[PDB]
Amino acid sequence: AEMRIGHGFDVHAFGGEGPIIIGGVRIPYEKGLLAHSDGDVALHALTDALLGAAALGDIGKLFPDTDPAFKGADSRELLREAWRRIQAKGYTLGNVDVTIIAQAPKMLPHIPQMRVFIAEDLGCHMDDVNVKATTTEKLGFTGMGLGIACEAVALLIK
Amino acid sequence: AEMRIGHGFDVHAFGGEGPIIIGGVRIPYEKGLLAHSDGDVALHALTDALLGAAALGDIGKLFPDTDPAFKGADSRELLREAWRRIQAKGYTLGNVDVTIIAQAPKMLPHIPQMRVFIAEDLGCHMDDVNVKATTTEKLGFTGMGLGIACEAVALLIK
Amino acid sequence: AEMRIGHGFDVHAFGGEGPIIIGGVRIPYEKGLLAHSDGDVALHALTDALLGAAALGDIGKLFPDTDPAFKGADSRELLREAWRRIQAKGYTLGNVDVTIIAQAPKMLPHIPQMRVFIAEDLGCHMDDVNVKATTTEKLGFTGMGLGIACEAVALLIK
């Protein structure tokens, strides 16, 4: 059994009306997130971490910012699709860990539901999906409420 | 033997008198770090990386920002406590890698002592604990001396 | 077979004439990168991820900012040298995943060539090297075109 590591990172800016979608979960907030998809940084970062582990590039590589094939869709579809590909190459999920970086809104109440979504989307047990949040103690663009960042790592098995 | 990956990230802002505690080590600096605990970003980030690998959430989940149980303590206690929990679920340490992001102070002289602390706190050999530092070449909130960031990754074995 | 995780992170600021070197690849851009070496954030971050996995510190530890031994060289040499050391301790490459964080230039056309370089430098198959890019949607120092950040993770086998 060969094992593979992956990393992902994403940022999206605030704009317009709430809510925001993070980890599939619709979360109420004063601002919404500017996006060409649904702006779900958590799932984008996770997808990159997963793809990178399977050495398949990134989301922008699999789903061009323009292309007809998979266009203007919600990030859960993109996640499921990438996982389809990652499995086609003969990988199963080791586990994933996600780190949301945001000053607000409060993510912790929504994390259990995010895990239901991700566990479903990758067809695994919840105990292989972990999600956290942190603030930057009001420092930097996230700390000064301009956007949200997210990091994810992934482990795969062949 | 099943293997598990984890990631952690933390930021704290400068304020008041030095010194700062980073990786358990008390380091002299003009400013100190604003915190509800001892503001040890290195250990916080490590703890999250470890917890995330064991799919146990984050420090804020285990030790609420308010709660009586483990209150206003130093981050080495929180680290040891989380490791107690991570072991209770039947995990041993693969290895940890930590990345301090700070313009100053200079971290490199203190890294050997940080590793003594962490290796003790997780009850392992030093050769399973790695710590680095980097500046952001004067860019961003860390680069403009407003705070310190840290990243950690962890590998666990069941 | 024991397995080891590593993480790396690097930033460099824009300045002077293009081009920039990223992942060994010379990429045309209006500004160049301020550096004591060639300012290759991608390879620096990768090297730290690799060294950290082998618990050998960071690049600044192996190659002091001043030292005669390996001085003012290009980052591919530093990468190859660190890999020599990492192998001397009895490690082979599991895989690496790299994440470039930059508003511009566009990295995606250059990624295939970056992988040729890294795969050569670590003497492995391309399918063990993954590289991505992302913008911070115009937010933060990278988003406001002041510099480039990069993250890397690495897996090693003993």
Ligand SMILES: Nc1ccn([C@@H]2O[C@H](COP(=O)(O)OP(=O)(O)O)[C@@H](O)[C@H]2O)c(=O)n1
């Ligand atoms: N400096 C950069 C940044 C991104 N990219 C590519 O552009 C894509 C999308 O960039 P983005 O930062 O807007 O990512 P999204 O969160 O919008 O999907 C990435 O997935 C990469 O393929 C690039 O080629 N060079």
Ligand SMILES: Nc1ccn([C@@H]2O[C@H](COP(=O)(O)OP(=O)(O)O)[C@@H](O)[C@H]2O)c(=O)n1
């Ligand atoms: N956007 C956010 C940020 C943090 N959190 C939670 O709040 C806790 C503490 O946040 P923090 O950024 O002040 O972390 P500390 O370094 O102060 O421990 C985290 O551990 C999460 O449980 C959240 O629910 N939503």
Ligand SMILES: Nc1ccn([C@@H]2O[C@H](COP(=O)(O)OP(=O)(O)O)[C@@H](O)[C@H]2O)c(=O)n1
């Ligand atoms: N706060 C810090 C930052 C960096 N360092 C050390 O200084 C070295 C170089 O720092 P740097 O941010 O300029 O890294 P480069 O990208 O210039 O190689 C690091 O590799 C660390 O060894 C430190 O001791 N304390």
Ligand SMILES: CC(C)=CCC/C(C)=C/COP(=O)(O)OP(=O)(O)O
């Ligand atoms: C964990 C990672 C990837 C850290 C990199 C730091 C980063 C992207 C800072 C954003 O700039 P900023 O918020 O400091 O911009 P400014 O302070 O200029 O508003």
Ligand SMILES: [Mn+2]
């Ligand atoms: Mn806090």
Ligand SMILES: [Mn+2]
């Ligand atoms: Mn430097």
Ligand SMILES: [Mn+2]
């Ligand atoms: Mn975008």
Ligand SMILES: [Zn+2]
């Ligand atoms: Zn995105």
Ligand SMILES: [Zn+2]
């Ligand atoms: Zn903290």
Ligand SMILES: [Zn+2]
């Ligand atoms: Zn560098």
